[PDB]
Specification:
The structure is cut from a larger assembly and holds two copies of chain A and one copy of chain C. By secondary structure, chain A is α+β, with helices and mostly antiparallel strands. Chain A has a single domain, classed as Protein Inhibitor Of Neuronal Nitric Oxide Synthase (2-Layer Sandwich). Chain A contains two helices and four strands, in the order E-H-H-E-E-E. Chain A is globular. Classes of the chains: A alpha+beta, C mainly alpha. Strand 2 of chain A pairs antiparallel with strand 2 of chain B. Chain C: This is Cytoplasmic dynein 1 heavy chain 1.
Amino acid sequence: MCDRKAVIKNADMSEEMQQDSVECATQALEKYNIEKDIAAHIKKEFDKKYNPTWHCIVGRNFGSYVTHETKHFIYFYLGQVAILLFKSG
Amino acid sequence: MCDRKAVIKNADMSEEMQQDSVECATQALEKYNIEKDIAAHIKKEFDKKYNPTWHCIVGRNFGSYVTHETKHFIYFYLGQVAILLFKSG
Amino acid sequence: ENIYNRLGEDLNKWQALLVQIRKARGTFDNAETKKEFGPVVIDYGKVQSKVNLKYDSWHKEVLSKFGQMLGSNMTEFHSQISKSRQELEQHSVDTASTSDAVTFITYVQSLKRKIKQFEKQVELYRNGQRLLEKQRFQFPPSWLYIDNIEGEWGAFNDIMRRKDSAIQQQVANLQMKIVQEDRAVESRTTDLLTDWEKTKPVTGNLRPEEALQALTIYEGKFGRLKDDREKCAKAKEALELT
């Protein structure tokens, strides 16, 4: 299991769901090779677990400025792949 | 004026609001050099304009899958910059 | 004007025109400017360039026409999505105005074919517009771009088939509602039959005016019963599952 040490850049959400996001993103990266598919998988999983409406961004170079509900925000890096997961709906 | 064609790629919105998006994003890209800053300016302008709440990403390499409000979504390209703007909230 | 009139309105024919003119230009391609025959020399290149420019202008203006009917399919897209949002939000299993409901239900089936119709048009369109970019169009923002709309049509179709089909299956409640409704209609029909048999004013002793008023009341409620019977029958045949 490739130890892609997740480095967390921003987080307004609990450590438990932080680890949940890290694990789900690692599973998606191991499972998918397209960034859009990884984002769709993570969004769908968080829609299932922590309820809609989530929004997931997977990419290597992007700038983001979004509004999120409290306790539902994360922005981290797995290797070079930055993933921004925040709830809004 | 550098004529960067705006490829209104995917969209659920009216034509006026998409052209307003193209104009505002052209202005932001002329004004700022940081993708985070471009997204911030575009999101703030549209928040002032069509009432909250939006989420905007500006970048080169990113894949996305979200839920937006109806008639309140666009994703396009200006120059070498992909810009997504969707409303959900 | 001549060629456009001869072609008329035909998108696939128009694409054929475009591939034909493209291949014609390509076959015209040449580098020599003068075909000397024996001791006779003839200019060849000046008219060559001139007719090449004539081809280019002609092909470009021919291309220019299609954007208008592309706008037509655009408006079709828009009319679909903006209104289908409302229409999906409209109906429900309850709301015994089911008739209107099933009316729209019949409506949506009438739309299904058109859906495919529009779909294949989009397919034809998604081909021609491709020519558009390899014919170097200045797609003005004015018009939607790719899934700019498209994506929205796919979304449309999927949302329709997700929920309309389901609500169509949950109709047994509506079916039994129609059943009891028509049963009450038949009961009222038999009651009105009995009332007519009782009410026969055929005797001449009755005052014509007063018995006329009574028959007018009977005919009003009889037309009401007829309306009930016909509306139940039309609801049955429109639903057509019962």
